[PDB]
């Protein structure tokens, strides 16, 4: 019930919480809405759903860039490094975000505009063979009971990763991540003083996200062959 003072980290923690909430609405504070598109059986790809999904995906990528620019120090890195970090973690952050909007009761996920799709629709919107993997991840994430602070910190840790290849100032990146790592650990103990194992458990989730995002890249190639036009440009650049 007692904790040493950590004003600086507390402050950083507050800034990250706000960056996330402002760049990604909460599941509760939003009006959910559905669609009847190919909601019953699975199809190779439902273009109507894809249209909306790729649009929301483009917008969330933009939100993630905004989130990045709100992280103390991020803009202090070279533009090259900013781009490298964002390209390396964007899909991971996108997957984490949608999974935190999973509703197990109805087996659905809710996008930032309220669109709520069931598993079959998520599959038909473009998730394809990655659908069950993603739902499994979301189901296993719920028990961690992460809030916006923990989610934002995890996204920030994933993004500010000095291990990414081709960084101009990897060390400078490592320097930025440490406070975030420290802040997440302390904040976790704040909420759960009994679960001293929640920190490593949450950190592990990042590696879990990677296994899915690594496959997402392959899904891009397949999607390119299924859709009539070009892959939305921003999605192209991020997975490029």
């Amino acid at each position: 019930e007692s904790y040493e003072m950590t004003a600086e980290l507390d402050d950083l923690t507050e800034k990250i919480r706000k960056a996330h909430q402002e760049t990604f609405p909460s599941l509760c504070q939003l009006g959910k809405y559905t669609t009847n598109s190919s909601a019953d059986h699975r199809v190779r790809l439902d273009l109507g759903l894809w249209d909306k999904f790729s649009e929301l995906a483009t917008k969330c990528i933009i939100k993630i860039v905004e989130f990045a620019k709100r992280l103390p120090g991020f803009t202090g890195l070279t533009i090259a490094d900013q781009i490298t970090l964002l390209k390396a973690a964007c899909l991971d952050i996108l997957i984490l975000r949608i999974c935190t909007r999973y509703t197990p009761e109805q087996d659905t996920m809710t996008f930032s505009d309220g669109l709520t799709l069931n598993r079959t629709q998520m599959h038909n919107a473009g998730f394809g063979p990655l659908t069950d993997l993603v739902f499994t991840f979301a189901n296993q994430l719920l028990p961690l009971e992460m809030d916006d602070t923990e989610t934002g910190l995890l996204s920030a840790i994933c993004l500010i990763c000095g291990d990414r290849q081709d960084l101009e100032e990897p060390t400078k990146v490592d320097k930025l991540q440490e406070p975030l790592l420290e802040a997440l650990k302390i904040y976790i103990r704040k909420r759960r003083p009994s679960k001293p194992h929640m920190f490593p458990k949450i950190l592990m989730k990042i590696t879990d996200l990677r296994s899915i995002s690594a496959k997402g890249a392959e899904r891009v190639i397949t999607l390119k062959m299924e859709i009539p036009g070009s892959m939305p440009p921003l999605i192209q650049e991020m997975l490029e």
Binding site: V65, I79, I83, L86, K87, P233, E237
Partner: peptide, 11 residues
């Protein structure tokens, strides 16, 4: 090249 991301990051 990442004309989109550059642009979004520069401003």
């Amino acid at each position: 090249r990442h004309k989109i991301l550059h642009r979004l990051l520069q401003e």
